[PDB]
Amino acid sequence: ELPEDPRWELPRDRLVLGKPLGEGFGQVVLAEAIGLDKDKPNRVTKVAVKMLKSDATEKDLSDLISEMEMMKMIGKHKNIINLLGACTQDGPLYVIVEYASKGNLREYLQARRPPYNPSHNPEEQLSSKDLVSCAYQVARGMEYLASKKCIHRDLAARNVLVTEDNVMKIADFGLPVKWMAPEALFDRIYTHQSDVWSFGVLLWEIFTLGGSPYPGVPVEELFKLLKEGHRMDKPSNCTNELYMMMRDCWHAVPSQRPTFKQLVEDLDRIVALTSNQE
């Protein structure tokens, strides 16, 4: 069996398992942790828990362990989904991570489109400042992952989660062609620079309020078209400046893309210059 790590161990009975959140190497459930903070033991905290499926394999387990251990090393950032604890000893492995009550960014955005809005439960409109700040937080998250030499490989709005307080958090960073840099797509060369390409696509999702990239373009055609220099059009409601940022992220030459460091700086300044009422 798996060895205990007292830095992260939480007794199994301090965890009240709640409702399925869906599949996410196994299944994720919502739960309540009692006394997650040892110096405040009568408090319940809403958390998310990952566990293996009933018909799951040895590969599924080893991958679940690696993910956890990887998260331990990467450490804490407010704009990633953080590790909170684990139950490793009294039965099935449970990995406990922060809970994002508002779901993933793509659906968060789509639901906040004016009357195509596929939600029968629409939500309140997002200002332009909200959209840029959303981009900024995602950049801050990636900046941190890049500084810890963590290469995401599948950055996209669907892999950003949104907390109750609308804090953006990178998901599944410790483990689709339409978000991949050409060099990733052609030669399986993933770098921080290719994540920067993926971020440009994510920027485009933000400012189309969760649009499908390259709509109607077949997957088999896309690489050719990208080699030809095809790039998505500017979203109807997006500043030229923000579009230029998209375009730089999609530089054919990977060395010529901005870094997440620089993107955070640029976005920081654009947020300050965007008012609450624009």
Beta-strand content: 5-15%
The CATH class label of the largest domain is: Mainly Alpha
Which fold does the CATH topology of the largest domain refer to?
A: Transferase(Phosphotransferase), domain 1
**So, the CATH homologous superfamily of the largest domain?**
Transferase(Phosphotransferase) domain 1
What is the number of domains? 2
Number of strands: 7
What's the main sheet like? 5 strands, antiparallel
Query: In one word, what is the shape?
Result: globular
Number of helices: 8
Query: Taking Cα atoms only, what radius of gyration do you get, to the nearest Å?
Result: 20 Å
Assign a percent range to the helix content: 25-40%
SSE arrangement, N to C: EEEHEEHHEEHHHHH
**What is the terminal-to-terminal distance?**
57 Å
Family: Belongs to the protein kinase superfamily. Tyr protein kinase family. Fibroblast growth factor receptor subfamily.
Cytoplasmic side: 1-278
Domain Protein kinase: 15-278
Active site: 154
Topology:
Layout lengths: L14 E9 L3 E8 L9 E8 L6 H17 L8 E5 L6 E5 L6 H7 L16 H20 L12 E3 L5 E3 L11 H6 L4 H16 L11 H9 L12 H10 L10 H14 L5
Antiparallel strand pairs: 1-2, 2-3, 3-5, 4-5, 6-7
Helix pairs in contact: 3-5, 3-8, 5-7
